Amino acid sequence: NLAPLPPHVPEHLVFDFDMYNPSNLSAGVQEAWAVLQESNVPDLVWTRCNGGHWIATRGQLIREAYEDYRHFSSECPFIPREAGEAYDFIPTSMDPPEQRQFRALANQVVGMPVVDKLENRIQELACSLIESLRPQGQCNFTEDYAEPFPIRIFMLLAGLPEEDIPHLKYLTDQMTRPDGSMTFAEAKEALYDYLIPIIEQRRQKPGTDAISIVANGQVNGRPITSDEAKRMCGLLLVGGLDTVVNFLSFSMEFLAKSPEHRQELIERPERIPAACEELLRRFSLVADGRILTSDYEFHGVQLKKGDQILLPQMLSGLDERENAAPMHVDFSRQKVSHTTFGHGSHLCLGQHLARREIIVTLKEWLTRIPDFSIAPGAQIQHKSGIVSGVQALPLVWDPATTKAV
Ligand code: HEM
Ligand SMILES: CC1(C)[C@@H]2CC[C@@]1(C)C(=O)C2
Ligand SMILES: [K+]
């Protein structure tokens, strides 16, 4: 359904891309979004889909807009507008300087020093899950590893019950890839309703789990409010439950389809961190955006106050102007340019946890299960949204080719 073209938008800038159901999704979600970078598409276009909004298609524009928070506000960061308007997570819905006190508090719970302390725990959980799968000769990778590995690490960090995972994971997905059974507001309210009594319990108490630390943090010379805590904790849960979870599946699908790349890392382990970075570029997966605070001419295009602009983090590293042969995976790529973790003041706080989870997975998977493939005749289906994902990833292998460590 196409929203009527607003009178300020020139007809030659129209390109009706649907971010929740892109036309060429069957080729792969990154491929479907990369259609925006074909020779027929300008660098700044208007889609009539999803209520109508701008899209910037190039790394240069995406970086520029994410630096200019004065014009491009994070107050309404999701499309469609009703989702962006309800969106009140902290720190993302705030801009500088207000945002910074909350970023600093979130860094106490997910920052590099926290991640470094978690090294053995992350290692143990990967090794144990993978060893349990190893002799079986098959798995449903999404449910058998991609979900429980990062999610259980997050639930440990947050001190939340593993039994709550199915419910919380379903709710988070409604905010990024809704199935239509819940509104954005309904899903967010349910997440908040879950967190409210937990936060009340952990406030004015000495817990050192992530929720306790957030709930007892001091911001702006006073205790954080219950409401501020809930808005932060909800965002941490969405990050924990719907980011790495999807990325691992894109990466493992690629490795299943590309034996030469598996061989590269099995036989050259110190290449894994570089490989991680290249996969983060090639299988980038996030796309949110901003709202115009004022009428503004941007690269000759008249943007109106209140217009939404989608600034897909996914697209910068896929841009030929940032990386030659962008769809090729080259673990020896000379400069790996991307904005996979975002750009500007909102740059991902979870990035260190993410990289550790990815690197540990690559090393510990290929050590035990060096040779695997997609189940014969399976068609892998992707799904698109604020965060994109893989519907299912059935893998098979000969257990005789595996190694118990
Ligand atoms: C592959 C993994 C991940 C990717 C690709 C990713 C991507 C991103 C992106 C693109 C942004 C900026 C969004 C914007 O500017 O509107 C962001 C912000 C953020 N991420 Fe990550 N993320 C990942 C993992 C995580 C994890 C594991 C957590 C927490 C456990 C997390 C927590 C956050 C938080 C709290 C912000 C908000 C920062 C702010 O607004 O100041 N992320 N992430
Ligand atoms: C865009 C994001 C990946 C970033 C962290 C979780 C997410 C869905 C947000 O709402 C901000
Ligand atoms: K909002």
Coordinates of C-alpha atoms and ligand atoms in Angstrom, one line a residue:
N1 CA 0.0 0.0 0.0
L2 CA 1.5 3.3 -1.2
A3 CA 0.9 6.5 0.7
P4 CA 0.1 9.5 -1.5
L5 CA 3.3 11.3 -2.7
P6 CA 3.7 14.5 -0.6
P7 CA 3.7 17.6 -2.7
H8 CA 7.4 18.5 -1.8
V9 CA 8.8 15.2 -3.2
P10 CA 9.8 15.2 -6.9
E11 CA 8.6 12.2 -8.9
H12 CA 12.1 11.2 -10.1
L13 CA 13.1 10.5 -6.5
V14 CA 10.3 7.9 -5.9
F15 CA 11.5 4.4 -5.3
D16 CA 8.9 2.2 -3.5
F17 CA 11.2 0.0 -1.3
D18 CA 9.4 -1.9 1.4
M19 CA 11.8 -2.4 4.3
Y20 CA 9.6 -5.1 5.9
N21 CA 9.1 -7.1 2.7
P22 CA 11.7 -6.1 0.1
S23 CA 11.0 -7.2 -3.5
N24 CA 14.1 -9.4 -4.0
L25 CA 14.1 -11.0 -0.5
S26 CA 14.5 -14.5 -2.0
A27 CA 18.1 -13.6 -3.2
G28 CA 19.1 -12.9 0.4
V29 CA 18.2 -9.9 2.6
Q30 CA 21.4 -8.0 2.1
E31 CA 20.9 -8.6 -1.7
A32 CA 17.4 -7.3 -1.4
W33 CA 18.5 -4.1 0.3
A34 CA 21.4 -3.7 -2.1
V35 CA 18.8 -3.2 -4.9
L36 CA 18.8 0.4 -3.5
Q37 CA 22.3 0.7 -4.8
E38 CA 21.6 -0.4 -8.4
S39 CA 22.4 2.1 -11.2
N40 CA 18.7 2.9 -11.6
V41 CA 18.4 4.3 -8.0
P42 CA 19.4 7.8 -6.9
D43 CA 21.3 8.2 -3.6
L44 CA 18.4 9.8 -1.8
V45 CA 15.0 8.5 -2.6
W46 CA 11.4 8.6 -1.3
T47 CA 9.4 5.4 -0.8
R48 CA 5.6 5.5 -0.5
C49 CA 5.7 2.2 1.5
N50 CA 5.2 2.0 5.2
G51 CA 3.5 5.5 5.4
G52 CA 6.1 7.2 3.3
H53 CA 9.8 8.1 4.1
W54 CA 13.2 9.0 2.7
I55 CA 16.0 6.4 2.3
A56 CA 19.7 7.3 1.9
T57 CA 21.4 4.6 -0.1
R58 CA 25.1 5.5 0.3
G59 CA 27.7 5.2 3.1
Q60 CA 28.7 8.9 2.6
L61 CA 25.1 10.1 3.2
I62 CA 24.4 7.6 6.0
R63 CA 27.5 8.7 7.9
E64 CA 26.8 12.4 7.3
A65 CA 23.2 12.2 8.5
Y66 CA 24.1 10.1 11.6
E67 CA 26.6 12.8 12.6
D68 CA 24.1 15.6 12.3
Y69 CA 21.7 14.9 15.2
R70 CA 20.6 18.6 15.2
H71 CA 18.7 18.0 11.9
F72 CA 18.3 14.2 12.1
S73 CA 16.8 13.4 15.5
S74 CA 16.6 10.0 17.2
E75 CA 13.4 10.8 19.0
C76 CA 11.4 8.9 16.3
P77 CA 13.9 6.3 15.1
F78 CA 11.8 3.6 13.6
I79 CA 9.5 3.3 10.6
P80 CA 6.5 3.2 10.5
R81 CA 5.8 6.5 12.3
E82 CA 3.5 4.9 15.0
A83 CA 6.4 2.6 16.0
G84 CA 9.0 5.5 16.0
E85 CA 6.5 7.6 18.1
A86 CA 5.9 4.9 20.7
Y87 CA 9.7 4.1 20.8
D88 CA 11.0 5.6 24.0
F89 CA 14.0 3.3 24.8
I90 CA 17.1 4.9 26.4
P91 CA 19.6 6.0 25.3
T92 CA 18.5 5.7 21.6
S93 CA 15.4 8.0 21.8
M94 CA 17.6 10.8 23.2
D95 CA 20.2 13.0 21.6
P96 CA 23.3 14.8 23.0
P97 CA 23.9 15.9 25.6
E98 CA 21.0 14.2 27.4
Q99 CA 21.8 10.8 25.9
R100 CA 25.4 10.7 27.2
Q101 CA 24.7 10.1 31.0
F102 CA 22.7 7.0 30.0
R103 CA 25.3 5.7 27.6
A104 CA 27.9 5.9 30.3
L105 CA 25.6 4.0 32.7
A106 CA 25.0 1.3 30.1
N107 CA 28.7 1.0 29.5
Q108 CA 29.1 -0.1 33.2
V109 CA 27.0 -3.1 32.3
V110 CA 27.9 -4.1 28.7
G111 CA 31.2 -2.2 28.1
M112 CA 34.6 -3.7 27.1
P113 CA 35.7 -4.3 30.7
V114 CA 32.5 -6.3 31.5
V115 CA 33.0 -8.3 28.3
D116 CA 36.6 -9.1 29.1
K117 CA 35.6 -10.5 32.5
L118 CA 33.0 -12.7 30.7
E119 CA 35.7 -14.4 28.5
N120 CA 35.7 -17.9 30.2
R121 CA 31.9 -17.9 30.6
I122 CA 31.3 -17.1 26.9
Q123 CA 33.9 -19.8 25.9
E124 CA 32.3 -22.4 28.2
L125 CA 28.8 -21.8 26.9
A126 CA 29.9 -22.0 23.2
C127 CA 32.0 -25.2 23.8
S128 CA 29.2 -26.9 25.8
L129 CA 26.4 -26.1 23.2
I130 CA 28.6 -27.1 20.3
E131 CA 29.9 -30.3 21.9
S132 CA 26.3 -31.3 22.5
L133 CA 25.4 -30.8 18.8
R134 CA 28.7 -32.2 17.4
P135 CA 27.9 -36.0 17.4
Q136 CA 24.3 -35.5 16.1
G137 CA 25.3 -34.7 12.5
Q138 CA 22.5 -32.1 12.1
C139 CA 20.9 -29.1 13.8
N140 CA 18.4 -26.3 13.3
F141 CA 21.1 -23.7 13.8
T142 CA 18.7 -20.8 14.6
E143 CA 17.1 -22.5 17.5
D144 CA 19.9 -24.8 18.5
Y145 CA 22.8 -22.3 18.7
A146 CA 22.1 -18.8 17.3
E147 CA 19.4 -18.2 19.8
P148 CA 20.5 -19.9 23.0
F149 CA 24.2 -19.0 22.9
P150 CA 23.8 -15.1 22.9
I151 CA 20.5 -15.1 24.7
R152 CA 21.6 -17.3 27.6
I153 CA 24.8 -15.1 28.0
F154 CA 22.5 -12.0 28.1
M155 CA 20.1 -13.6 30.6
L156 CA 23.1 -14.5 32.8
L157 CA 24.4 -10.9 32.6
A158 CA 20.9 -9.5 33.5
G159 CA 20.2 -12.1 36.2
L160 CA 16.9 -13.2 34.5
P161 CA 15.4 -16.7 34.4
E162 CA 16.1 -18.8 31.4
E163 CA 12.5 -20.1 31.5
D164 CA 11.5 -16.5 30.4
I165 CA 13.4 -16.6 27.1
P166 CA 10.6 -17.9 24.8
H167 CA 8.3 -15.1 26.0
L168 CA 10.8 -12.3 26.0
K169 CA 12.3 -13.3 22.6
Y170 CA 8.9 -13.3 21.0
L171 CA 8.2 -9.8 22.4
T172 CA 11.5 -8.3 21.2
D173 CA 10.9 -9.7 17.7
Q174 CA 7.6 -7.8 17.5
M175 CA 9.5 -4.6 17.7
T176 CA 11.9 -5.4 14.9
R177 CA 10.0 -7.9 12.6
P178 CA 6.4 -7.8 13.7
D179 CA 4.2 -10.7 12.7
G180 CA 1.0 -8.6 12.9
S181 CA -0.5 -10.2 16.0
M182 CA 0.9 -7.4 18.4
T183 CA 1.2 -3.7 17.9
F184 CA 4.6 -2.1 18.6
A185 CA 3.0 -0.4 21.7
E186 CA 1.6 -3.7 22.9
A187 CA 4.9 -5.5 22.7
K188 CA 6.8 -2.7 24.4
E189 CA 4.2 -2.4 27.1
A190 CA 4.5 -6.2 27.7
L191 CA 8.3 -5.9 28.0
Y192 CA 7.9 -3.0 30.4
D193 CA 5.3 -4.8 32.4
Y194 CA 7.8 -7.7 32.8
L195 CA 10.6 -5.4 33.9
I196 CA 8.7 -3.1 36.3
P197 CA 8.4 -5.4 39.3
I198 CA 12.0 -6.8 38.8
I199 CA 13.4 -3.2 38.8
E200 CA 11.3 -2.3 41.9
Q201 CA 12.8 -5.5 43.6
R202 CA 16.4 -4.6 42.6
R203 CA 16.2 -0.9 43.4
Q204 CA 17.8 0.2 46.8
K205 CA 19.4 -3.3 46.8
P206 CA 23.0 -4.3 46.3
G207 CA 22.7 -6.7 43.3
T208 CA 25.5 -6.7 40.7
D209 CA 23.6 -8.1 37.7
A210 CA 23.1 -5.7 34.8
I211 CA 19.5 -4.7 35.8
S212 CA 20.5 -4.0 39.4
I213 CA 23.5 -1.8 38.3
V214 CA 21.2 0.1 35.9
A215 CA 18.4 0.4 38.4
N216 CA 20.7 1.8 41.1
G217 CA 22.7 4.1 38.8
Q218 CA 23.2 7.8 39.4
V219 CA 22.5 10.0 36.4
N220 CA 22.4 13.8 36.3
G221 CA 23.3 14.1 40.0
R222 CA 20.4 12.0 41.3
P223 CA 19.2 8.4 41.3
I224 CA 17.9 7.1 38.0
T225 CA 14.1 7.0 38.0
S226 CA 12.2 3.7 37.8
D227 CA 10.9 4.8 34.4
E228 CA 14.4 5.7 33.1
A229 CA 15.7 2.3 34.3
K230 CA 12.9 0.4 32.6
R231 CA 13.4 2.3 29.3
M232 CA 17.2 1.4 29.5
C233 CA 16.7 -2.2 30.6
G234 CA 14.2 -2.8 27.8
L235 CA 16.7 -1.7 25.2
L236 CA 19.4 -3.9 26.6
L237 CA 17.1 -6.9 26.4
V238 CA 16.3 -6.1 22.7
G239 CA 20.0 -5.8 22.0
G240 CA 20.7 -9.1 23.9
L241 CA 17.9 -11.0 22.2
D242 CA 17.7 -9.8 18.6
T243 CA 21.1 -8.8 17.2
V244 CA 24.0 -11.3 17.5
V245 CA 21.2 -14.0 17.4
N246 CA 20.5 -13.1 13.8
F247 CA 24.0 -12.2 12.7
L248 CA 25.4 -15.7 13.7
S249 CA 22.8 -17.3 11.4
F250 CA 23.8 -15.2 8.3
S251 CA 27.4 -16.0 9.0
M252 CA 27.0 -19.8 9.6
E253 CA 24.8 -20.0 6.5
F254 CA 27.6 -18.4 4.5
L255 CA 30.2 -20.8 6.0
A256 CA 28.0 -23.8 5.2
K257 CA 27.8 -22.7 1.6
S258 CA 31.5 -21.8 1.2
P259 CA 34.0 -24.6 2.1
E260 CA 37.0 -22.5 1.0
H261 CA 36.2 -20.0 3.8
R262 CA 35.9 -22.7 6.4
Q263 CA 39.3 -24.0 5.3
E264 CA 40.8 -20.6 5.6
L265 CA 40.0 -20.3 9.4
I266 CA 40.6 -23.9 10.3
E267 CA 44.1 -23.7 8.9
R268 CA 44.7 -20.1 9.9
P269 CA 43.1 -19.3 13.4
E270 CA 44.7 -15.9 13.9
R271 CA 42.6 -14.8 10.9
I272 CA 39.4 -15.2 12.8
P273 CA 39.2 -11.6 14.2
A274 CA 39.6 -10.2 10.6
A275 CA 37.1 -12.7 9.3
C276 CA 34.7 -11.5 12.0
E277 CA 35.0 -8.0 10.8
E278 CA 34.5 -8.9 7.1
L279 CA 31.4 -10.9 8.0
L280 CA 30.0 -8.0 10.0
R281 CA 30.4 -5.9 6.9
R282 CA 29.0 -8.4 4.4
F283 CA 26.1 -9.7 6.6
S284 CA 25.3 -6.4 8.2
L285 CA 21.7 -6.5 9.3
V286 CA 20.4 -3.3 11.0
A287 CA 18.4 -0.4 9.5
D288 CA 16.7 2.3 11.5
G289 CA 16.7 6.1 11.0
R290 CA 15.8 9.5 12.2
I291 CA 13.3 12.3 12.0
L292 CA 13.8 15.8 10.6
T293 CA 13.7 18.5 13.3
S294 CA 13.3 21.3 10.7
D295 CA 12.9 21.9 7.0
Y296 CA 16.4 21.1 5.6
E297 CA 18.0 20.9 2.2
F298 CA 20.2 17.9 2.2
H299 CA 22.4 17.3 -1.0
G300 CA 19.9 19.4 -3.0
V301 CA 16.9 17.5 -1.8
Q302 CA 14.2 19.4 0.2
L303 CA 13.4 17.5 3.4
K304 CA 10.5 18.8 5.5
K305 CA 10.2 19.0 9.2
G306 CA 8.7 15.7 10.4
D307 CA 9.8 13.7 7.4
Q308 CA 11.3 10.3 8.4
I309 CA 14.5 9.2 6.9
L310 CA 15.7 5.6 6.9
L311 CA 19.5 5.5 7.2
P312 CA 20.3 1.8 6.8
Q313 CA 23.4 0.9 8.7
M314 CA 23.5 -2.3 6.6
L315 CA 24.1 -0.3 3.4
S316 CA 27.3 1.6 4.1
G317 CA 29.6 -1.5 3.9
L318 CA 27.8 -2.9 0.8
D319 CA 28.3 0.4 -1.1
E320 CA 30.8 -0.1 -3.9
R321 CA 32.0 3.5 -3.0
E322 CA 33.2 2.1 0.4
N323 CA 34.4 -1.4 -0.6
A324 CA 35.3 -2.8 -4.1
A325 CA 33.4 -6.0 -5.0
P326 CA 31.2 -5.4 -1.9
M327 CA 29.2 -8.7 -2.1
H328 CA 32.4 -10.7 -2.1
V329 CA 33.6 -12.1 1.2
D330 CA 37.3 -11.6 1.4
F331 CA 38.8 -12.4 4.8
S332 CA 42.0 -10.6 3.6
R333 CA 40.1 -7.5 2.6
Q334 CA 42.6 -4.6 2.9
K335 CA 40.3 -2.0 4.4
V336 CA 37.0 -3.3 5.8
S337 CA 34.7 -0.2 5.7
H338 CA 31.3 -0.5 7.4
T339 CA 28.7 1.1 9.7
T340 CA 27.3 -2.2 11.0
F341 CA 27.3 -1.0 14.6
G342 CA 26.0 2.4 13.6
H343 CA 27.7 5.8 13.4
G344 CA 27.7 9.0 15.5
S345 CA 26.6 9.5 19.1
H346 CA 24.4 6.3 19.1
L347 CA 27.2 3.9 18.0
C348 CA 26.6 0.4 19.4
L349 CA 27.4 -0.1 23.1
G350 CA 27.0 -3.9 22.7
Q351 CA 29.7 -4.1 20.0
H352 CA 32.4 -5.7 22.2
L353 CA 30.1 -8.4 23.5
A354 CA 29.0 -9.0 19.9
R355 CA 32.5 -9.4 18.6
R356 CA 33.5 -11.7 21.4
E357 CA 30.4 -13.9 20.8
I358 CA 31.2 -14.0 17.1
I359 CA 34.9 -14.8 17.4
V360 CA 34.3 -17.5 20.1
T361 CA 31.6 -19.0 17.9
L362 CA 33.8 -19.1 14.8
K363 CA 36.8 -20.7 16.6
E364 CA 34.8 -23.1 18.8
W365 CA 32.5 -24.2 15.9
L366 CA 35.2 -24.8 13.4
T367 CA 37.4 -26.6 15.9
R368 CA 34.7 -29.2 16.5
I369 CA 32.6 -29.2 13.3
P370 CA 34.9 -28.2 10.5
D371 CA 32.8 -29.6 7.6
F372 CA 29.1 -29.0 7.3
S373 CA 26.5 -28.0 4.7
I374 CA 23.0 -26.8 4.3
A375 CA 20.5 -29.7 4.4
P376 CA 20.0 -31.1 0.9
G377 CA 17.4 -29.2 -1.1
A378 CA 16.7 -26.7 1.7
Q379 CA 15.9 -23.1 0.6
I380 CA 17.1 -20.6 3.2
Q381 CA 14.5 -17.9 3.8
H382 CA 15.5 -14.5 5.2
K383 CA 13.2 -11.9 6.9
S384 CA 13.5 -8.2 6.8
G385 CA 12.8 -5.4 9.3
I386 CA 14.6 -3.0 11.7
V387 CA 16.9 -6.0 12.3
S388 CA 17.0 -8.7 9.6
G389 CA 17.2 -12.4 10.2
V390 CA 17.2 -16.0 9.0
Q391 CA 13.9 -18.0 9.4
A392 CA 15.6 -21.4 9.7
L393 CA 19.0 -22.9 9.0
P394 CA 19.0 -26.7 8.8
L395 CA 22.7 -27.9 8.8
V396 CA 24.0 -31.4 8.3
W397 CA 27.4 -33.0 8.7
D398 CA 29.2 -36.4 8.9
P399 CA 30.0 -36.9 12.6
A400 CA 33.2 -38.9 11.6
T401 CA 34.6 -35.5 10.3
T402 CA 34.1 -33.9 13.7
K403 CA 36.5 -33.5 16.7
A404 CA 35.6 -33.7 20.4
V405 CA 38.1 -31.4 22.2
Ligands
HEM1 C1 25.7 -8.0 15.6 C2 25.4 -7.4 16.8 C3 24.9 -6.0 16.9 C4 24.7 -5.1 15.9 C5 24.8 -5.2 14.4 C6 24.2 -3.8 16.6 C7 23.9 -2.7 15.9 C8 23.6 -1.5 16.5 C9 23.3 -0.2 15.8 C10 23.4 0.0 14.3 C11 23.1 0.7 16.7 C12 22.8 2.2 16.5 C13 21.2 2.4 16.3 C14 20.9 3.9 16.0 O1 21.8 4.7 15.8 O2 19.7 4.2 16.1 C15 23.2 0.1 18.0 C16 23.0 0.7 19.3 C17 22.9 0.1 20.5 N1 23.1 -1.2 20.8 FE1 23.9 -2.6 19.3 N2 24.2 -4.0 17.9 C18 24.6 -5.3 18.2 C19 24.7 -5.9 19.4 C20 24.3 -5.4 20.6 C21 24.2 -6.1 21.9 C22 24.6 -7.5 22.1 C23 23.7 -5.2 22.8 C24 23.4 -5.4 24.4 C25 23.6 -6.5 25.1 C26 23.5 -3.9 22.2 C27 23.1 -2.7 22.7 C28 22.9 -1.5 22.1 C29 22.5 -0.3 22.8 C30 22.1 -0.2 24.2 C31 22.4 0.7 21.7 C32 22.0 2.2 21.9 C33 23.2 3.2 22.0 C34 22.7 4.6 22.0 O3 21.5 4.8 21.5 O4 23.4 5.4 22.5 N3 23.9 -4.1 20.8 N4 23.5 -1.2 17.9
LIG2 C1 18.6 -0.6 16.2 C2 19.0 -1.5 17.4 C3 19.9 -2.7 16.9 C4 19.8 -0.7 18.5 C5 19.8 -1.7 19.6 C6 18.6 -2.5 19.5 C7 17.9 -1.9 18.3 C8 16.7 -2.7 17.7 C9 17.5 -0.5 18.8 O1 16.2 -0.2 19.1 C10 18.7 0.3 18.9
K3 K 9.5 8.4 20.3

